[PDB]
């Protein structure tokens, strides 16, 4: 069904920061100059997702997890009830 | 045959609404309209009780309002210091899914009871520290629900058939038995000078027996729905009961009818448990929607809101010297409230 | 039969909670009333007791 | 550099584990995963250190 | 006190027409789920047909699809049957049950011996003469 | 003074030791539930499992395959009324519900049993495994044809067998034309309400049948695999 | 150019991980097995960011 | 046939064979019958008296 192929579509994308694929693609890339479009394309891509994937990892996991938003949820409106 | 019983009971059952309405002479609200109110109560949790592996289903105090009894559904039967939360005891249960827990008024025994409608009765007497099953009971078909101590030999015992004994514990058998339910009794309250107790059952009605003659007094029906819980007014001549129906009904003894409703609009949950205060002007009423209620017994206003929970409030108990109380949830936690100046 | 006996019991039941004593609302009440009142200071809960004599700090 | 990386290993594994294994111990595993994410990269940069030093 | 009469049945010629009133007094009508239970001679309690609070979903038995009409009534705090082309087999004493819960699609022991939120019920006989 | 609270303090950690090791064992173990109408040969079942050696109210049985153990749970001595002591259920593994097929009569009654289940508003999420029990007794039914189905439920009529069914060359095509309605008519109730929540995995058992033991092992393997990857939301 | 990329993105990675760290310790609710690797994981990143820095 | 079945529906006893055979009630179990030591003494009583 549709639904499922989303749902799995979904599931790979939230899944794929944290198990870091994205590292797969230069994986096995030996040293090449540095006045190179292998060398450019590399630096750019790397410096890029690795740096960002800590930042994707907190969002997916901590700021978007379910059980933390309902906490969250509860503390502060708690805390405005009793202040 | 039938034509002609059924007929009389119905008579009989509009002389008792009669009789009722001929004694309203008035309302408890009407006559409670000049009373300063109780005002918003914050209550902070004070201590935090964990170590129960599933949920928990019932709690007692004690006497000198230290230790308590809390029973768990996987087999756990833990006794708690209040204070230093400190753990004295915990029972390995025979068997795991566990309803009910006491508290004997002199601490020398603790019993319990279940879906195997057995009452097993632990004592804590024992020189060499190892606790042990001091009696059980096998005498109820249903599940057992609820039980209370008399004294050191005497306990009542609530179950699912419809029916409550009268055990004593030094022969095991039972020495007065109470069928007058049409449905499965949930809880029973004991009066504080222990010659009467209700009992709550599934049929919406509130029944009074005598531990002596045990014979019932008096009926109340005014709930609309299965009564969960029950309990005693500190002065002994009212109880108050709670039910799924989302609203809790305070009963007269001497007026034989329902005083006041604390029913909320925008509540539509059920009732766990509920317990009067060491004066009786609040009634803590736990609510399946993850939190509880302090109601005022006399203005039927929410003084205030106790909401430390992260499932239902399946118990909740108050200390005799009302210093503090104690609430225990499905999520494995004891929480214990008390006010602040 | 069971019916009949169940009957039976009821209407002995009803009989017996019908001749028992009643005492007036209004003088019920008051009982309930002056009970609060008396014990009204001995309550810490309705009266909040000073941090140095309360137990739990 | 390391103990970052082999902590994405560390959540691969665990998560492997926990689907494809009926029973866990919490604290067995737990200790042993965070000793391979921390200490395994400590003995490579130290092996490492070594030989250059 | 929860209480439920049931009016109407009685002898009944097979293919004719019947109609059953439940009376309900003492909670709110509303609130709560509605139920229809028969018991055949020397039979046990089978479940008839539910109506919900609102009426906007019912749902009947496989023997009785097609021939019987559930309706409530909220303001007048009554529940019927409308029953058409009776079959001999049929003949049986109704109960109106109350689901035993408010705001809730189940109810567990409607269909149980000793049910305490049903009415007496009524007798109906689909007997040819 | 601190003699006491010394002495109490031991006591407490050594309380703790003894819950940290049961902490261990209770979830080790999975436990299950299991229920229906006595007209299912429930107690043929509890017979089989009972092979797995390792006022009377509920009994359990414990038996072990694959060196995980389970605790099946049976009410036989309790009230017929079952809406207050199955609450304490809501932790169970899983529930499973037996259901004779071959009673006709008495299926619309496992139906509603099972749609009270299925709906409750506590076991939200715990899943249910129906074992349609002794499917010999249905076959054996449908072959003779005094007794017709069409007459219970007048849908059957117009009912034809699922493309995906699966069966078994030597059986007749009517005796899977009636198990597959059944088995449809209990997933209509199933993904009627239940979306992801909790699953409902069909079965086809006999009573003689010593596989029970392995569909359940599969089907609490799945539940606990489900429940994982929604804890990622994944699924 | 590749520089400015990677202490940007390090940045802002180290800001939300420190919050996600903050948050998950303080709550006692989502103290777990997951969790607790989950803010080892997180950790690591941080400790790769700030060394880099 | 099947005296797996009468045995289950004995044990469970929601159905009384008395009501059909009313003569069950004033039945013994035969001396000479053999009756399995594992089996209940209420599912031998009711399967003898089939077979008397």
């Known amino acids: 069904t549709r639904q499922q192929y989303r749902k799995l579509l979904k599931s790979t994308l939230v899944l794929m920061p944290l198990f870091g694929v994205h590292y797969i693609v230069f994986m096995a890339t030996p040293y090449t100059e540095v006045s190179g479009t292998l060398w450019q394309v590399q630096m750019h891509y790397e410096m890029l997702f690795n740096s960002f994937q800590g930042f994707f990892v907190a969002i997916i996991y901590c700021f978007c997890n379910g059980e933390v938003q309902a906490e969250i949820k509860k503390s502060w409106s708690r805390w405005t009830l009793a202040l | 045959e039938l034509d002609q019983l059924r007929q009389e009971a119905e008579q009989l059952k509009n002389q008792i609404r009669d009789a009722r309405k001929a004694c309203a002479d008035a309302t408890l609200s009407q006559i409670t309209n000049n009373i300063d109110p109780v005002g918003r109560i914050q209550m902070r949790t004070r201590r935090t009780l964990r170590g129960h592996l599933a949920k928990i289903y019932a709690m007692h105090w004690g006497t000198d309002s230290r230790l308590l009894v809390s029973a768990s559904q996987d087999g756990k039967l833990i006794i708690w210091d209040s204070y230093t939360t400190n753990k004295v005891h915990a029972i390995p249960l025979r068997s795991s899914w566990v309803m009910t827990c006491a508290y004997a008024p002199s601490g020398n025994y603790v019993a319990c009871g279940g879906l195997d409608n057995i009452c097993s009765i632990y004592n804590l007497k024992t020189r060499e520290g190892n606790v042990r099953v001091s009696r059980e009971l096998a005498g109820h078909t249903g599940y057992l629900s609820c039980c209370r101590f008399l004294d050191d030999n005497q306990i009542v015992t609530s179950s699912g058939d419809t029916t409550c004994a009268l055990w004593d514990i030094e022969t095991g058998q039972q020495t007065t038995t109470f069928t007058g339910h049409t449905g499965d009794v949930m809880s029973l309250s004991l009066a504080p000078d222990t010659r009467l107790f209700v009992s709550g059952a599934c049929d919406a009605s509130a029944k009074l027996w005598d531990v002596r003659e045990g014979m019932c007094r008096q009926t109340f029906t005014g709930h609309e729905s299965d009564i969960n819980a029950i309990c005693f007014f500190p002065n002994g001549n009212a109880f108050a009961t709670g039910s799924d129906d989302a609203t809790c009904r305070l009963f007269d003894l001497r007026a034989d009818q329902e005083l006041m409703t604390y029913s909320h609009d925008n509540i539509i949950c059920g009732i766990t448990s509920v317990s009067f205060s060491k004066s009786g002007r609040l009634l803590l009423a736990g609510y399946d929607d993850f939190n509880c209620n302090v109601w005022d017994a006399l203005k039927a206003d929410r003084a205030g809101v106790l909401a430390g929970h992260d499932n239902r409030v399946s118990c909740l108990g108050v200390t005799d010297d009302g210093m503090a109380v104690a609430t225990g949830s499905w999520d494995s936690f004891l929480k214990i409230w008390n006010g602040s100046s | 039969t069971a019916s009949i006996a169940q009957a039976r019991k009821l209407v002995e039941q009803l009989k017996m909670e019908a001749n028992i004593d009643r005492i007036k609302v209004s003088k019920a009440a008051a009982d309930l009333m002056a009970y609060c009142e008396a014990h009204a200071k001995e309550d810490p809960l309705l009266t909040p007791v000073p941090a140095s004599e309360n137990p739990f700090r | 550099l390391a103990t970052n990386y082999y902590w994405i290993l560390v959540e691969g594994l665990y998560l492997h584990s926990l689907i494809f294994m009926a029973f866990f111990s919490e604290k067995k595993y737990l200790w042993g995963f965070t000793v391979f994410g921390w200490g395994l990269p400590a003995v490579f940069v130290a092996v490492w250190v070594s030989v250059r030093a | 006190q929860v209480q439920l009469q049931e009016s109407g049945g009685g002898l009944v010629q097979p293919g004719g027409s019947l109609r059953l009133s439940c009376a309900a007094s003492g909670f709110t009508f509303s609130n709560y789920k509605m139920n229809w239970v028969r018991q055949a001679p020397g039979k046990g309690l089978e479940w008839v047909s539910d109506i919900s609070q609102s009426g906007a979903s019912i749902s009947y038995t496989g023997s009785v699809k097609g021939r019987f009409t559930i309706s409530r009534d909220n303001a007048k705090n009554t529940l019927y049957l409308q029953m058409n082309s009776l079959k001999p087999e049929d003949t049986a004493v109704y109960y109106c049950?109350?689901?035993?819960?408010?705001?809730?699609?189940?109810?567990?022991?409607?269909?149980?011996?000793?049910?305490?939120?049903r009415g007496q019920g009524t007798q109906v006989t689909v007997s040819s003469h | 003074l601190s003699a006491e609270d010394k002495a109490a303090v031991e006591r407490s950690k050594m309380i703790e030791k003894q819950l940290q090791k049961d902490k261990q064992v209770y979830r080790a173990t999975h436990r299950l539930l299991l229920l229906g109408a006595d007209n299912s040969g429930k107690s043929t079942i509890v017979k089989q499992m009972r092979i797995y050696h390792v006022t009377s109210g509920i009994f359990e049985t414990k038996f072990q395959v694959d060196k995980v153990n389970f605790h099946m749970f049976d009410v036989g001595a309790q009230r017929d009324e079952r809406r207050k002591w199955i609450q304490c259920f809501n932790d169970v593994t899983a529930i499973i519900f037996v259901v004779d097929s071959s009673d006709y009569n008495r299926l619309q009654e496992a139906l509603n049993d099972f749609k009270s289940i299925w709906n409750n508003r506590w076991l939200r999420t715990i899943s249910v495994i129906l074992f349609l029990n002794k499917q010999d007794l249905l076959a054996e039914k449908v072959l003779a044809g005094k007794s017709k189905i069409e007459d219970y439920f007048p849908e059957f009529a117009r009912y034809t067998t699922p493309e995906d069914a699966t069966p078994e060359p030597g059986e007749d095509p009517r005796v899977t034309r009636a198990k597959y309605f059944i088995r449809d008519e209990f997933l209509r109730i199933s993904t009627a309400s239940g979306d992801g929540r909790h699953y409902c995995y069909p079965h086809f058992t006999c009573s003689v049948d010593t596989e029970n033991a392995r569909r359940i092992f599969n089907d609490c393997r799945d539940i606990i695999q489900r429940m994982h990857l929604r804890q990622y939301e994944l699924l | 150019r590749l520089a400015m990329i990677y202490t940007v993105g390090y940045s802002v990675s180290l800001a939300s991980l420190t919050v996600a760290v903050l948050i998950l310790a303080y709550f006692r609710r989502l103290h777990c097995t997951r969790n607790y690797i989950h803010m080892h994981l997180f950790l690591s990143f941080m400790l790769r960011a700030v060394s880099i820095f | 046939n099947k005296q797996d079945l009468l045995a289950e529906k004995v044990l469970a006893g929601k159905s009384k064979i008395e009501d059909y055979f009313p003569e069950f009630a004033r039945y013994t179990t035969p001396e000479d019958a053999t009756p399995e030591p594992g089996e209940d003494p209420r599912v031998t009583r009711a399967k003898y008296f089939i077979r008397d």
């Open positions: 049950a109350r689901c035993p819960a408010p705001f809730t699609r189940d109810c567990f022991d409607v269909t149980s011996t000793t049910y305490a939120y």
